[PDB]
Every structure is written in C-alpha cells, then in structure tokens.
C-alpha cells in the first residue's frame with residue numbers, strides 16, 4: 001500500500017463517519033506520530049479556519065487536494081449551499097480525497113476536479129458555470145502559484161474582494177508569487193506567520209489525587 | 214552567556230512588562246525557534262492551566278522552577294489570596310526565575326525556595342507555617358518524584374483532595390512513580406496524553422485580496 005492509502009485506513013479505523021472534526025484529529029495524529037505528510041496541518045489550519053469564518057465565501061477554489069485534509073477543514077465551515085471546488089492532478093490522490101470526503105459526510109459540498117490547474121482553470125466558466133470565485137486556496141506545486149494567479153486574472157475569475165490564501169510562502173517558499181502580489185496594486189496583502197506540522201514526541205502528565213492514608 | 218540568560222534577555226527584549234501572557238509567548242517562540250529548553254511547554258501547559266482552573270488551589274508547591282515558565286503559567290491563573298511556592302536547587306536558575314517573575318509582574322504571588330526538595334520539604338511547616346498543600350507540580354529530576362511523594366506524605370503535607378500533577382511520566386518517563394500512584398489506594402489517577410515541545414520550522418500563509426486590474 002501507499003502512504004495515502006495508510007492515512008485513509010487510519011481515519012476509517014479511528015474517526016467517526018459524518019464527524020469532520022474527528023477526521024481532522026485522526027489525520028493530525030497519524031501525520032505527527034506515524035508518517036509525515038504534506039497536509040496544511042493544524043497550526044496553519046486554524047488560520048485557514050479564521051479566514052473562512054471571516055469572509056463566509058459562497059464559492060471556494062482549492063488548488064491541490066492531496067488526501068482531502070484542507071478540503072475537510074474548509075467544507076466543514078461553509079454555510080449551507082456554499083461550495084468548494086478542488087483541483088487535483090494525481091488521480092490516486094483524488095481517489096483518496098473522494099473517500100475522505102464521503103467518510104466525513106461533506107461530499108455534497110465539495111466537487112473534485114480531476115486534472116491540472118493549468119488545464120482546468122480555463123474550463124471553469126464554460127464547463128462548471130462559474131462566474132467569479134469568492135476565495136482561492138493555493139497549495140499545489142509552488143512554482144505554479146504565480147502562473148495560476150495570472151491565469152485566474154486573465155480568465156476573469158477574480159473580482160474585487162476575492163480572497164487568495166497561499167500556503168508555504170516561506171517554506172518551501174514562493175518568492176516570485178510573494179513579490180508579485182505584494183508589489184502589485186491589484187492585491188492587498190496580509191501575512192500570517194505560523195509553523196509547519198512536523199513529527200512529535202508523545203508525553204503526558206499524570207494527575208494523582210490523594211485520598212488519605 | 215548561558216542559555217537561560219539568553220532566554221531571559223529575549224523575554225525582556227520582546228515581551229511586554231507586566232504581561233504574563235506575552236512572557237509565555239516570548240519563551241515559547243525562543244525555545245521552539247532558537248534553542249530548545251526543558252520548559253513544560255505550551256501543549257502540556259494548556260493541560261496545567263485547565264487543572265489550575267478546575268481546582269482553584271490556594272497553596273501550590275512546584276518542584277523544579279528552571280527559568281520560571283511554569284511558575285508564570287500557574288501564578289497568572291491563581292485567585293486573590295492564593296500563593297505558589299517553588300523549589301529550585303540551582304542558584305543560577307533560581308535567580309533567572311526571580312527576574313522572570315519580576316518582569317511578568319507576578320513576584321507578589323510566588324516565593325522561590327533555593328535548595329533541594331528533599332531538604333526543604335520537611336521544613337515547610339516550620340519555616341512557612343504550611344498546614345497542607347492544595348496542589349503539587351512535580352517537574353524536577355525524575356528519580357525524585359516517588360521519594361518526594363513519599364516524603365510529602367510522611368511530613369503531613371497532603372490532605373484528602375490534594376492534587377499531584379506530574380510532568381514527563383512517559384518521556385523521559387517516571388515508571389516507579391507511576392506504578393506507585395496508580396497501584397496505591399491512596400491516589401486516584403488520571404492520565405493526560407500530550408506532546409513534548411520540540412523545535413519547529415516557521416512557515417506562513419499570505420492573504421492577498423484582489424482589487425481589480
């Protein structure tokens with residue numbers, strides 16, 4: 001089996017179907033105690049959660065699904081009738097994502113788009129009936145953040161107020177993208193500093209309440 | 214200089230005087246980005262916080278102060294009239310702890326005792342007219358947890374309801390202590406699983422809001 005198949009199996013064993021919180025917690029545990037994986041992670045996930053709650057987007061685009069962790073994070077906070085589209089070019093990853101969404105009970109709010117962003121973004125208006133996007137989460141290969149931002153602009157998919165949220169602008173880093181959006185009057189930028197989710201060591205406290213001799 | 218001098222300087226440089234929360238955050242930042250140190254840490258510190266809030270102890274004894282991190286955590290949550298005694302054998306560390314508490318503005322709630330727990334525990338009743346303790350936090354050298362627990366009992370410092378809270382019962386581990394309190398009818402035990410505070414890698418998200426062409 002693969003790492004992504006092992007993550008899904010761990011979720012199926014330990015999380016609760018229909019409970020997105022339990023799914024996030026199970027992936028967090030597996031990927032900090034058993035095998036590291038490139039999910040956005042809990043620390044940066046809290047920041048993502050706050051951006052979703054603040055802007056209450058009706059239509060979100062995610063670039064890079066992997067196993068569905070960030071899709072589960074975002075979709076569980078969407079208002080009724082709000083939607084997430086997520087693009088993923090690795091079909092085995094997309095297959096895991098679909099199963100993860102089904103387990104979490106969020107499959108009716110998320111649509112997986114199979115293929116590469118450079119091929120699918122130009123299809124959003126015609127094939128998927130998108131007018132403009134309310135929010136875009138960028139988390140795919142880092143050398144594509146800037147070209148896809150420019151493609152979204154050229155295709156007329158952004159409007160005033162559309163929120164781009166980009167992972168990993170420090171590590172592995174996206175210096176061309178950062179230079180562009182920070183230097184351009186077309187974007188108002190805010191940086192949110194945080195941490196990667198690396199492997200951890202389990203420890204514990206014991207509470208012992210004295211009962212008398 | 215020493216690691217503990219560098220930690221204290223980083224706090225004085227970056228935290229707000231009189232603000233315990235800012236002091237904790239500065240220590241967290243230094244000891245996860247610059248140099249690891251044996252503080253209880255933020256994850257286990259949240260559990261400590263919850264125990265303090267649940268039992269609202271009027272008299273707390275801490276075994277092992279180091280730089281004052283856990284003393285700041287506990288003292289900032291103590292109610293009016295409550296006090297913390299902390300024992301620290303290392304005079305250099307005891308001095309750092311005093312400066313740390315002074316900076317945080319918590320010095321009037323904490324009394325530092327500079328000596329070894331096995332020497333000072335039998336003197337608490339005579340030197341401070343202690344009757345019994347409401348809570349004990351054990352976080353000193355791990356081979357002393359069991360003998361100091363037995364000494365606290367012998368010297369009459371525990372009452373029915375006194376809460377012992379022990380750090381590191383998994384890593385580095387306190388197997389004799391754990392076997393004793395879990396096995397003994399004199400203690401009712403609860404385990405709180407958590408994680409060590411190891412070094413982290415800074416990353417961040419960028420929020421870029423589109424304004425138009």
Ligand SMILES: C[S@@+](CC[C@H](N)C(=O)[O-])C[C@H]1O[C@@H](n2cnc3c(N)ncnc32)[C@H](O)[C@@H]1O
Pocket residue numbers: 038039040041063064065066067068069070071087088089090093115116117118139140141144
């Ligand atoms: C870091 S992972 C996604 C993690 C996910 N956002 C999360 O937080 O759970 C990166 C993903 O992007 C996919 N990918 C990379 N370039 C892509 C592109 N141009 N179009 C679509 N998917 C892409 C990869 O196959 C991979 O699954």
Ligand SMILES: C[S@@+](CC[C@H](N)C(=O)[O-])C[C@H]1O[C@@H](n2cnc3c(N)ncnc32)[C@H](O)[C@@H]1O
Pocket residue numbers: 251252253254276277278279280281282283284300301302303306328329330331352353354357
């Ligand atoms: C892990 S550190 C304490 C960390 C502190 N509780 C915190 O979370 O910020 C251990 C400390 O215990 C002190 N120590 C070890 N054995 C002791 C003893 N028998 N009596 C008093 N202090 C002791 C050491 O000098 C050291 O500073």
Ligand SMILES: O=[N+]([O-])c1cc(O)c(O)c([N+](=O)[O-])c1
Pocket residue numbers: 038039040139140141142167168171172196
């Ligand atoms: O190597 N990493 O720490 C990461 C982290 C990440 O969050 C990534 O998205 C990533 N990637 O897409 O290649 C790599």
Ligand SMILES: O=[N+]([O-])c1cc(O)c(O)c([N+](=O)[O-])c1
Pocket residue numbers: 251252253352353354355380381384385409
């Ligand atoms: O080595 N460690 O990870 C630790 C952690 C700790 O929390 C400790 O208290 C410690 N010690 O007192 O020696 C050591």
Ligand SMILES: [Br-]
Pocket residue numbers: 089090
């Ligand atoms: Br691929």
Ligand SMILES: [Mg+2]
Pocket residue numbers: 038039040139167168
């Ligand atoms: Mg990422």
Ligand SMILES: [Mg+2]
Pocket residue numbers: 251252253352380381
């Ligand atoms: Mg400790």
